[PDB]
Amino acid sequence: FTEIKSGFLERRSKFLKSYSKGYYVLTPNFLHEFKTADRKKDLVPVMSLALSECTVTEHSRKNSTGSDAKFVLHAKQNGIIRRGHNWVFKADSYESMMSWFDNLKILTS
Amino acid sequence: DHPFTEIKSGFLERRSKFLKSYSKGYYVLTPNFLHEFKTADRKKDLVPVMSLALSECTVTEHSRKNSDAKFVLHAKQNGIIRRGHNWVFKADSYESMMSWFDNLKILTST
Amino acid sequence: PFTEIKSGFLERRSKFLKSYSKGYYVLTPNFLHEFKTADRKKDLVPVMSLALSECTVTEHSRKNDAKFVLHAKQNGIIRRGHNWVFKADSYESMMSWFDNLKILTST
Amino acid sequence: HPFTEIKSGFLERRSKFLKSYSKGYYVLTPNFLHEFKTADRKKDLVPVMSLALSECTVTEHSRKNSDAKFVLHAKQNGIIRRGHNWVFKADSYESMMSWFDNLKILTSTS
Ligand SMILES: O=P(O)(O)O[C@H]1[C@H](O)[C@@H](O)[C@H](O)[C@H](O)[C@@H]1O
Ligand SMILES: O=P(O)(O)O[C@H]1[C@H](O)[C@@H](O)[C@H](O)[C@H](O)[C@@H]1O
Numbered sequence: 560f561t562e563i564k565s566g567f568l569e570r571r572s573k574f575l576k577s578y579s580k581g582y583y584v585l586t587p588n589f590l591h592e593f594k595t596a597d598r599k600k601d602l603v604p605v606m607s608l609a610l611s612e613c614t615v616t617e618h619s620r621k622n623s624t625g626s627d628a629k630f631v632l633h634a635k636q637n638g639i640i641r642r643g644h645n646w647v648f649k650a651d652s653y654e655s656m657m658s659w660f661d662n663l664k665i666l667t668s
Numbered sequence: 669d670h671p672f673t674e675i676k677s678g679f680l681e682r683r684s685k686f687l688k689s690y691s692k693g694y695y696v697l698t699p700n701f702l703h704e705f706k707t708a709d710r711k712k713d714l715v716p717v718m719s720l721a722l723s724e725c726t727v728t729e730h731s732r733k734n735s736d737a738k739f740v741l742h743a744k745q746n747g748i749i750r751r752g753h754n755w756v757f758k759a760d761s762y763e764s765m766m767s768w769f770d771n772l773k774i775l776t777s778t
Numbered sequence: 779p780f781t782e783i784k785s786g787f788l789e790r791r792s793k794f795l796k797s798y799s800k801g802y803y804v805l806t807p808n809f810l811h812e813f814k815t816a817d818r819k820k821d822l823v824p825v826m827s828l829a830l831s832e833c834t835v836t837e838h839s840r841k842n843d844a845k846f847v848l849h850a851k852q853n854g855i856i857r858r859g860h861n862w863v864f865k866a867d868s869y870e871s872m873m874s875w876f877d878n879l880k881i882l883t884s885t
Numbered sequence: 886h887p888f889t890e891i892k893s894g895f896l897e898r899r900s901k902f903l904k905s906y907s908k909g910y911y912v913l914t915p916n917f918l919h920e921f922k923t924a925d926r927k928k929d930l931v932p933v934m935s936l937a938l939s940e941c942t943v944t945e946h947s948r949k950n951s952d953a954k955f956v957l958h959a960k961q962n963g964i965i966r967r968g969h970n971w972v973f974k975a976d977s978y979e980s981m982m983s984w985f986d987n988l989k990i991l992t993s994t995s
C-alpha cells in the first residue's frame with residue numbers, strides 16, 4: 560500500500576523482440592512486478608528491481624512535439640539484470656510513461 | 669548503492685519446520701515488506717530471497733523474558749506462507765526480539 | 779507515498795465544555811494526527827499529533843454508540859492519567875478506529 | 886517502544902531571521918520530517934514541527950570539501966511558505982548525504 564506509482568507496463572524482451580505485461584509498483588526502494596493488480600491476494604512480487612542499482616537513460620519523444628511511450632532502465636550492477644544491460648518498458652501513452660520516467664529519474668539519480 | 673527506506677534491519681534466524689533447523693538471513697523491514705537477503709551487503713546483494721507483504725501478516729506470540737528471543741509471524745493470506753500458517757523467528761536477545769516484534773506490530777495492525 | 783492506517787472525521791469531546799468539535803484525523807503507526815480539513819495536498823500541518831506510544835485505548839461504546847476513550851500514559855498533549863473521548867459516525871466506524879488503536883497501543 | 890523511523894539524528898537548521906543555526910533532533914518517517922527538542926524517544930514526543938514530505942523537495946547540497954549542508958524546498962504553503970527554502974547542516978558530508986538521499990527517495994512526487 561505504500562508507493563510512488565503503480566500501473567501496468569509492458570516490458571520488452573531484447574532477444575524475443577516481444578512484450579509482456581505486468582502490474583508494476585514503484586516504491587522508494589524497488590520497481591516491483593506482480594502478475595496482477597490485486598494487492599490483497601497477489602502478494603509475492605514476480606521480481607523486485609532495486610532502484611539503487613539502476614538508472615533511467617532514455618525515453619520516447621512525444622509524437623506531436625505505445626509508439627511514443629517507452630523508456631529504458633539501465634542496470635549499473637548485477638542484480639535481476641546483468642551489469643551494463645538495459646530493459647525497455649512501454650506504458651500506454653507518452654504522458655503515463657513520463658510519469659514513470661520522471662519519478663525514476665529522481666529515485667535513481 | 670545508497671539510499672533505502674528501512675525501518676529496521678539485522679540478522680534473524682527463521683525456523684524451518686521441514687528442515688528442523690534455523691536459517692539465518694539478513695532482514696530489512698520497510699513500510700511494505702519484511703524482506704530477507706542472504707547477506708548484509710546493502711550495496712550489492714539487493715535481490716530479496718523473499719519479500720513478505722506486511723498487509724497480510726501479523727505478529728502474534730513472543731517469548732517471555734525469563735532462547736527467550738523468539739516471535740511468531742502469522743499469515744492471513746496465501747503468499748510466501750500458506751493462509752493461517754506461522755513462521756518462527758529468533759533474534760540474538762529478548763531486547764532485539766522485542767524491537768522486531770513492536771516495529772512489526774505497528775505496521776500490521778489492519 | 780503516505781503510509782496511513784486509517785483516516786476520517788472524528789468528534790473529540792471537551793470534558794470541561796461538554797461539547798464536541800470535529801476534526802479530520804489520520805492514524806499512522808506513530809501518531810493520531812488531527813487536521814482541520816481532509817485536503818491532504820494543501821492542509822499540511824497537523825493541528826496536533828498524539829504519540830501512540832504514550833496512549834492506550836481503554837473503553838468504547840457497546841452496539842445499540844460510537845465513542846471510545848484514549849487514555850494518556852504520559853504527559854504529552856494530554857496530561858498523564860487523563861482521557862479524551864472521541865465519537866465516530868457509527869459503532870462500526872468507531873470499532874475500526876478502536877481495533878487499530880488497541881493493537882498500536884497494547885503493551 | 887516502537888516508531889516507524891527511517892532516519893533520525895541531530896540537524897542544525899539556519900533561520901534566515903535569527904542569523905544562526907538552531908539545533909533539533911529530527912526523525913524522518915515515510916510521511917514527515919519531524920523536529921523534536923530532544924532525543925528522548927520515550928518521553929519528548931510532541932513534535933516542534935512536522936514537515937509534510939508530499940510537499941517538500943530536496944534541491945541542492947554541499948560539494949565535498951561547512952560541506953555538510955542541504956536545502957529543503959517547499960512546494961506548498963505549510964510550515965514553509967510555497968517556494969521558500971530551508972537550509973540544514975549535518976555533522977559531516979557523509980551524514981548530510983544520508984539525510985539528502987533518504988529525503989530524495991521519499992519526495993520524488995512533491
Ligand atoms: O537488456 P539486455 O539484457 O537485452 O542487454 C543487451 C544490451 O541491451 C545491449 O546493449 C548489448 O548489445 C547486448 O546485446 C545485451 O544483450
Ligand atoms: O535455547 P536456544 O538458543 O538453543 O534456542 C533453541 C530453541 O529452544 C528451540 O526451540 C529451537 O528448535 C532451536 O533449536 C533453538 O536452537
Ligand SMILES: O=P(O)(O)O[C@H]1[C@H](O)[C@@H](O)[C@H](O)[C@H](O)[C@@H]1O
Pocket residue numbers: 899951974
Ligand atoms: O562550518 P563553518 O565554520 O564554515 O560555519 C559556517 C556555517 O556552516 C554556515 O552555514 C554559515 O553560513 C556561516 O557562513 C559559517 O561560516
